[PDB]
Amino acid sequence: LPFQQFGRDIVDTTDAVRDPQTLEILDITPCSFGGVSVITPGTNTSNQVAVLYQGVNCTEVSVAIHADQLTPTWRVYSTGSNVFQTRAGCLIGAEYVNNSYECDIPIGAGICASYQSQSIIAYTMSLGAENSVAY
Amino acid sequence: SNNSIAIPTNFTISVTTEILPVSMTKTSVDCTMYICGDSTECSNLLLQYGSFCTQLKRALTGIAVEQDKNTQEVFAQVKQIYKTPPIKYFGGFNFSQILPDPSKPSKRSPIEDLLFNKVTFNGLTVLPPLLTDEMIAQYTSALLAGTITSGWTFGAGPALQIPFPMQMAYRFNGIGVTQNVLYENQKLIANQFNSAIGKIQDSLFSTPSALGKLQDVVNHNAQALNTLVKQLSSKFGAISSVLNDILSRLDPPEAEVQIDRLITGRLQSLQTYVTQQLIRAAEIRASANLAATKMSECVLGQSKRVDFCGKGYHLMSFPQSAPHGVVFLHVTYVPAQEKNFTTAPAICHDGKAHFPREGVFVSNGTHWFVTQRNFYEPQIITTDNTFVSGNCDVVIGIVNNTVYD
Amino acid sequence: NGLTVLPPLLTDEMIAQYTSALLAGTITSGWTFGAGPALQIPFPMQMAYRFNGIGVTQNVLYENQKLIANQFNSAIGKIQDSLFSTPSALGKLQDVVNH
Amino acid sequence: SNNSIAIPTNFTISVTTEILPVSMTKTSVDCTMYICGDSTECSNLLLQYGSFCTQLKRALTGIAVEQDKNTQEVFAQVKQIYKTPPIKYFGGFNFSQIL
Amino acid sequence: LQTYVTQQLIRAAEIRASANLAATKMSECVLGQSKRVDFCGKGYHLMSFP
Ligand SMILES: *[C@@H]1O[C@H](CO)[C@@H](O[C@@H]2O[C@H](CO)[C@@H](O)[C@H](O)[C@H]2NC(C)=O)[C@H](O)[C@H]1NC(C)=O
Ligand SMILES: *[C@@H]1O[C@H](CO)[C@@H](O[C@@H]2O[C@H](CO)[C@@H](O)[C@H](O)[C@H]2NC(C)=O)[C@H](O)[C@H]1NC(C)=O
Ligand SMILES: *[C@@H]1O[C@H](CO)[C@@H](O[C@@H]2O[C@H](CO)[C@@H](O)[C@H](O)[C@H]2NC(C)=O)[C@H](O)[C@H]1NC(C)=O
Ligand SMILES: *[C@@H]1O[C@H](CO)[C@@H](O[C@@H]2O[C@H](CO)[C@@H](O)[C@H](O)[C@H]2NC(C)=O)[C@H](O)[C@H]1NC(C)=O
Ligand SMILES: *[C@@H]1O[C@H](CO)[C@@H](O)[C@H](O)[C@H]1NC(C)=O
Ligand SMILES: *[C@@H]1O[C@H](CO)[C@@H](O)[C@H](O)[C@H]1NC(C)=O
Ligand SMILES: *[C@@H]1O[C@H](CO)[C@@H](O)[C@H](O)[C@H]1NC(C)=O
Ligand SMILES: *[C@@H]1O[C@H](CO)[C@@H](O)[C@H](O)[C@H]1NC(C)=O
Ligand SMILES: *[C@@H]1O[C@H](CO)[C@@H](O)[C@H](O)[C@H]1NC(C)=O
Ligand SMILES: *[C@@H]1O[C@H](CO)[C@@H](O)[C@H](O)[C@H]1NC(C)=O
Secondary structure, eight states, rough: TOOOOOOOOOOOOOOEEESSSSSOEEEEEOOOOOOOEEEOOOOOOOOOOEEEEEEEOOHHHHHHHHHHOOOOOOOOOOSSSEEEEEEEEEESSSEEEEEOOOOOEEEESEEEEEEOOOOOOEEEEOEEEEEOOOO | OOTTTEEEEEEEEEEEEEEEEEOOOOOEEEEEHHTTTTHHHHHHGGGGGGTTHHHHHHHHHHHHHHHTTTTHHHOOOOEEEEOOSOOOSSOOOOOOTTSSSSSSTTOOOOHHHHHHHHHOOEEEEEEEEEEEEEHHHHHHHHHHTTTTTSGGGGGGGSOOOOOOHHHHHHHHHTTTTTTTTHHHHHHHHHHHHHHHHHHHHHHSOSSSSGGGGHHHHHHHHHHHHHHHHHHHGGGGTOOSOOHHHTTSSOOGGTTTHHHHHHHHHHHHHHHHHHHHHHHHHHHHHHHHHHHHHHHHISSSSSOOOOTTTSEEEEEEEEEEEETTTTEEEEEEEEEEEEEEOOOOEEOOOSSSEEEEESEEEEEESOOOEEOSSSOOOOOOOOOGGOOOOSSSSSSSEEEEEBBBO | EEEEEEESOOOOHHHHHHHHHHHHHTTTSGGGGGGOOOOOOOOOHHHHHHHTTTTTOOOHHHHHHHHHHHHHHHHHHHHHHHHOOOGGGHHHHHHHOOO | TTTOOOOOOOOOOOOOOOOOOOOEEEEEEEEHHHHHTTHHHHHHHHGGGGGGTHHHHHHHHHHHHHHHHHHHHHOOOOSOOOOOSSOOOOOOOOTTTTO | OOOHHHHHHHHHHHHHHHHHHHHHHHTTSSSSSSOSTTSSSSSSSOOOOO
């Protein structure tokens, strides 16, 4: 209405504004952030690592990596074989496979990772060997 | 009255539910984004308080990790995923409501769907659970299909096979009722069972307040978060609740006084939230242990504990998944239609007391009989079902009769 | 100063009524009243069942019925005195008040 | 020894006891009266702390409500108030000390 | 007050843990005879009285 300038949300924080000259309504949303996790086999076995960015889509990760992002501990994404999209977040540095095994390093919603020349693979965990007793 | 007894003549099959919470939501809280934000001065001041955040991070990590040991302990009771045969005939017992339905996409049972439809920034995120809801379903289906075609055998070694009516005969024999009672009523009991399951469905349609226990486990989270994210708009005795405004109106040497009050208030709020979470997690684990025990002793075997796996003598149970918990369907045995008789604890004959093998002596007014203790079935007295053990001049209440051969 | 104490929902007479109901159901019915309708049975027969439940045949009770009853009464007699002499007998409940 | 066994020829009936706490005292607290008293000046300062008092009331109310479910769960086990028979002869046993 | 309320919460948890055991001794010792060793007394259980 012609007499409000600021705005608020279901809490007490400004999330809109009116430009003093070009009298237009503008939204406000903050820039992305979240946790970071490192997935590694023991230093006794191997020395490679994989990285998980929690709660983002992979395109916003790739764009920011091409322009600007904190934690400059950058990994190399060779092809689509590196970037992978889980429910938890983008998984950079692991190749998704087609088989099923036991869970070794739990990651997210049914996804587990393991060290199988050698590299790091992420798959879908298996609940056990199928069986059917002959009633 | 000191010489009269009552013995039932007709039974009943009933099904009663029971709901238990198992796990709660996983959360992770980041200090510097909550307390401070992007301001460097706030973090440089927060470094003077020691390690008040590593402890919080460790405690919440411990709670989150524990939340997945609660589900791995209730459902992961088996190492094989059993199936059910294509021919869905089990002597007349009808399991269509509990077994999975392949037509729908998520492969849940109708009761499971009904259950699923009845239950509803600043560094405050939620982690997803490890086991998706389409895996809990597979565990539940394997548990259900191992107890139909094997009985209790699959919980103590290799799963051995046996037809269903023979299993139910075993389970009647396990509560003091002979086998034949089932075989002469096999149809009736089957129908007696089939309707009970149906009632369950309606008992969850009309009543909305059935699943409060799970619902609370959800509600108690939201409040606990809401309050936290509201506590960010309190001055705590300072001049404003926004760090940027203070940093844009006061000389930095004069601003530590204002920033300190905010820092202390926010630390206090975080500590309160963490402690409440710790206590609630303790309660949830206490419940999950009982859920695991009930899975082990009512589903994988028949229980002799009173009022543990249902009200009445116990027959079996069936698990069904649910959001953040589990639901059990206990199948019990309730006597009915009692009839009165006159009794006495011995039968004198040829100067020898006579006591039954198992059963109680019963009179119908003129004749004497010995019958089992839970379902009226009289028999002609005979030395085959009595033992002598003593003389006739000691026992009290003994009634003299004849015993054939 | 601002602190109040609330009364329990159930009075003491109601709790005594529940206690008496439970006591009267386990004398004339045994354990049958805990699974359906309450079925009556004379008390010595119930005790014979409860001997049969620990691997001792029924006759042992009948040939000793007069003796066993005595051994019960003496026991039930002594408990009262055992609730006088021992000071810490009610150690638990007392603390609930004190704490 | 590998060929010798012992078997008892007489028994004993004994009565023990056991005490278990069930519930504790319910309370409730009014913040403003306890902290600031009846001062109008103090309450304005206290109001700057947000919701440190709704939490406390909620916690105490939860405890108080649970203290009734405990007693309801222990004692309300049956839904028919059975009455003891008038004449008290049960084969030679008193129950007079418990009835 | 915060100290008092936390103490009360912990004691309430303890009391609930103790009150979930009377509810079981009332079902397996009072409503029926038990087979768990040393549950309803020291010996071979016969019956119980609240
Ligand atoms: C035991 O109870 C069952 C439960 O009702 C009785 O079954 C009914 O019997 C009547 C006549 O006997 C039939 O008209 C009904 O159709 C039966 N019900 C069902 C669901 O089939 C049974 O008759 C009783 N038996 C005895 C011996 O009392
Ligand atoms: C087991 O119970 C189900 C549930 O009622 C039965 O399925 C019904 O089948 C009839 C006949 O096709 C349909 O008219 C009903 O609509 C079905 N019910 C539902 C809920 O879809 C099933 O027939 C029973 N099992 C057997 C072997 O008859
Ligand atoms: C089993 O023990 C009881 C109790 O010690 C014995 O009963 C006693 O028997 C003596 C024998 O003369 C009497 O003097 C006592 O008065 C009895 N005690 C009571 C409390 O009445 C009983 O005799 C023992 N069993 C056997 C077979 O000897
Ligand atoms: C239960 O045992 C008690 C203990 O002897 C009996 O109570 C006594 O009864 C007599 C006569 O009735 C009185 O002279 C005593 O004073 C009573 N003793 C006490 C401590 O009160 C009681 O009679 C027995 N039960 C029955 C049904 O007779
Ligand atoms: C994928 O990224 C787009 C933006 O390019 C976003 O709108 C979408 O939500 C992301 N996908 C998921 C599943 O979040
Ligand atoms: C592996 O490839 C097969 C063939 O397309 C596919 O059906 C299967 O889902 C794949 N495994 C995955 C995606 O985990
Ligand atoms: C107990 O039974 C006897 C029969 O042996 C009878 O004489 C007596 O009256 C009964 N007891 C009572 C209290 O009626
Ligand atoms: C026992 O018989 C009496 C009358 O003879 C009757 O009132 C009572 O109902 C009978 N008992 C039962 C359990 O029906
Ligand atoms: C008792 O059972 C016998 C067995 O046939 C029967 O002849 C008699 O009439 C019955 N008595 C009564 C009172 O019904
Ligand atoms: C055990 O049995 C052997 C016979 O094989 C016998 O020589 C030995 O004395 C027995 N043990 C005892 C303690 O008597």
